[PDB]
């Protein structure tokens, strides 16, 4: 496992797009813990349980916790955008619909290893990209 600079760029763009990094290049402190907990849940419980937990918006948490799932979808979409025709025959290169539920997308597409690898890549990229910024 080695995270590419392109993945970090996608993570930065997605964090800015789903209103996580402010215009002052700062983020709420709880999102680092959110991302670490998501990684731990993914490895321990599974993709479906972790994505279902962090896709919730009725959660009374201290911040908009679904934003990391939105950033995940944005990173995966950007990754699938740069897929080659050689890759498109083996990998599912389709862009994940924006309104579509990420957990529902995973479930309807089985539980393929491709989605798990993409989720793990994007989670580590989110971790590093958040580490690049300051936490106020």
């Amino acid at each position: 496992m080695k995270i590419s600079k392109k993945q970090i760029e996608y993570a930065i763009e997605a964090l800015r797009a789903n209103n996580i990094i402010t215009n002052d290049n700062q983020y709420p402190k709880v999102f680092k813990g959110y991302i670490s907990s998501f990684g731990a849940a993914v490895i321990q419980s599974g993709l479906i349980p972790a994505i279902i937990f962090f896709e919730n918006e009725d959660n009374d948490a201290n911040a908009d916790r679904h934003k990391i799932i939105g950033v995940l979808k944005d990173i995966i979409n950007a990754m699938r955008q740069q897929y080659t025709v050689t890759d498109a025959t083996i990998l599912v290169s389709s862009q994940i619909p924006a309104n579509y539920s990420m957990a529902q997308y995973i479930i309807e597409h089985g539980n393929t290893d491709q989605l798990l690898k993409e989720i793990t890549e994007a989670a580590v990229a989110m971790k590093l990209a958040l580490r690049m910024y300051k936490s106020e």
Binding site: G39, A40, V42, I43, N111, T120, V124, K127
Partner: protein, 279 residues
């Protein structure tokens, strides 16, 4: 009398830590083979652990493993230790607590290694393992498969809902092969085995450091599951017969347990080493 195959049966979880900075979930990962990416024990670590076990017998360690790092003279090691490649990994199921998981490519690598290195009892093992491999390939016809050799273990979920077991009632599993590879044996396609043996599916253990009852650190550790089987080759050099016999007798007794890897004080990596039984 020169080359021997030894099976490592781990009585607890094993962590042979690689020197790796993973910035994802698992802070400490285990060593993986440079080619097949399967968990393995580096020959240096195995030699160090076995030398540590025999440290009391100065003569045996000096003649078989070589001289100590701090010595005016250096003595070349006589016995050659090869890296311990993974053979069988327990996989969680629904019908049974755990099955012994092997892959067709792992079996191919084992047959190739036995052919190349000429183990002591290699001929019959090579013949029967080969025959089993052609039978499995004939049945599979390219598609992914999970083949058990007990009719009771049919439809078993091999750690994943996608991987379901079926019993091919044409492939006999000989008793000696069962002894070598494990009691409840499932042979998987390489795709299935690599899915089951990757960094997202290997067992992980959570650890934290407390300061006066309050947590200071938190990290995740990757371990090789308990009762896993790894095989390594031992080459007798020009070593003395007496020391070699003592070493083999001590290594292959049921009361000998060797610590391999990290976290010795908390029980990680206690193993039993068994010589390749005649077929």
């Amino acid at each position: 009398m020169t080359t021997r195959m030894y099976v490592i049966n781990t009585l607890s979880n094993m962590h042979v830590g690689s020197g790796e900075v993973n910035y994802g979930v698992i802070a400490n990962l285990i060593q993986r083979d440079s080619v097949t990416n399967l968990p393995n024990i580096n020959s240096s670590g195995l030699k160090g652990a076995i030398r540590e076990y025999f440290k009391e017998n100065e003569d045996l360690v000096r003649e078989l493993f070589g001289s100590a790092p701090r010595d005016e003279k250096t003595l070349p090691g006589k016995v050659r230790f090869f890296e311990a490649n993974l053979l069988s990994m327990p996989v969680r199921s629904d019908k049974v607590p755990f099955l012994m998981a092997i892959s067709d490519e792992v079996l191919q690598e084992l047959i190739t290694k036995m052919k190349f290195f000429n183990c002591e009892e290699a001929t019959q093992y090579i013949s029967h393992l080969s025959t089993l491999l052609d039978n499995i390939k004939t049945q599979a016809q390219g598609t992914d498969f999970a083949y058990v050799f007990d009719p009771l273990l049919q439809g078993a979920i091999i750690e994943e809902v996608s991987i379901r077991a079926t019993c091919p009632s044409h492939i006999p599993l000989q008793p000696s092969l069962k002894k070598l590879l494990g009691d409840r044996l499932v042979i998987l396609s390489h795709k299935y085995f690599s899915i089951l043996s990757d960094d997202n599916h290997l067992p992980v253990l959570s650890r934290n450091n407390l300061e006066n009852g309050q947590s200071a650190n938190l990290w995740y550790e990757q371990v090789l599951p308990r009762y896993s089987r790894l095989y390594f080759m031992l080459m007798d050099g020009n070593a003395q017969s007496e020391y070699l016999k003592k070493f083999r007798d001590t290594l292959c007794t049921p009361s000998t347990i060797i610590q391999i890897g990290a976290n010795a004080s908390i029980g990680y990596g206690y193993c039993q080493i068994s010589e390749l039984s005649p077929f």
